[PDB]
């Protein structure tokens, strides 16, 4: 008598006081579907790791093995790993022996999944590189943050003035200018959604 045909509302071909409210509801519904595309256009127009505490890094034996993620030995990062994580060192023999560049080349060609190095050298070999290769969530992983220094003789006379001069360069933004000059880069659901929608409609 009523309701069911009205409840159909927006559909294919498929009286009394009912007709007026049915027309009003149909107008509201068609306005709603018209605005559906509007909000879709307004709204419309991702990380595989979060830290060394991840199960994959912490536990070398977890399903598939990481493809020999490694680092350049004989440095600071290697000492950090060998000291604070004396379990990663056992699963670190299959590292990239040569300097950085070979590791980047191997990473591009799916040889290894992750590279752990300095946060400035590698951050440079993440923007100058063609295409785009990204670091883990920016500088959110940065572990034991320290700074590049200027080694001096133990208790030297020049330890005091150099420091002062260096601090001056931070005040006048000269170091910022040098960083901008020498460290500038340019890098800075289809089938799945279709299957999900089909399954939802079928259910």
């Amino acid at each position: 008598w009523l309701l069911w045909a009205l409840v159909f509302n927006n559909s294919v071909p498929v009286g009394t006081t009912s007709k007026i409210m049915v027309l009003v509801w149909a107008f509201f519904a068609v306005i709603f579907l018209a605005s559906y595309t509007a909000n879709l256009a307004a709204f419309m127009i991702v990380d595989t790791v979060s830290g060394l505490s991840d199960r994959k890094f912490q536990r070398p034996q977890e399903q598939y093995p990481p493809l020999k993620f490694g680092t350049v030995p004989n440095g600071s990062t290697e000492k950090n790993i060998r000291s604070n994580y004396p379990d990663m060192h056992s699963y670190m023999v299959r590292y990239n022996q040569p300097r950085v560049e070979e590791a980047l080349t191997q990473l591009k060609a799916g040889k290894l999944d992750a590279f752990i190095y300095d946060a400035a050298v590698l951050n440079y070999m993440a923007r100058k590189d063609e295409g785009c290769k990204l670091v883990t969530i920016g500088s959110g992983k940065v572990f034991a943050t320290t700074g590049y220094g200027i080694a001096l003789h133990k208790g030297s006379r020049w330890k005091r003035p150099i420091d002062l001069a260096l601090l001056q360069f931070l005040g006048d933004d000269e170091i910022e200018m040098l960083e901008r000059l020498w460290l500038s880069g340019i890098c800075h659901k289809l089938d799945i959604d279709n299957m999900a929608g089909v399954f939802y409609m079928l259910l």
């Binding site: 559906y36 127009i45 089938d191 279709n194």
Partner: protein, 119 residues
């Protein structure tokens, strides 16, 4: 001019839609070409013009599904380049490389200009 519908739709969406439509037509025809012909004609774009009432019920549900899928396809279709360097301080020009080649007139004012700015 159009040359873009294959990117978000390709063969996958077309095959999925065709398989779903044909399976639906066969199933709801059997549980009731010929009647299936116009039943499939209903499941096409918008439309072309007991057991039966609830059959119309699931047909309406499938039509809501089809309309929603068409809306999603339209929303995925609306999409949109690059052609400009930045100037004289762009990283591409700031860092020389064999990939990018730029030159000026030899022995001219530009050669004079790029010989006093040591930086």
């Amino acid at each position: 001019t159009l040359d873009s519908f294959m990117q978000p739709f390709q063969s996958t969406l077309w095959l999925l839609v065709g398989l779903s439509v044909h399976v639906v037509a066969v199933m709801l025809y059997l549980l009731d070409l010929s009647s299936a012909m116009w039943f499939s004609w209903g499941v096409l774009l918008n439309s072309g013009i007991s057991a039966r009432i609830l059959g119309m019920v699931w047909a309406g549900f499938a039509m809501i599904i089809v309309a929603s899928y068409t809306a999603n396809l339209a929303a995925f279709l609306v999409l949109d380049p690059e052609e400009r360097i930045t100037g004289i301080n762009d990283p591409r020009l700031r860092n020389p490389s064999d990939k990018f080649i730029y030159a000026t007139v030899k022995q001219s004012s530009v050669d004079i200009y790029f010989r006093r700015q040591v930086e």
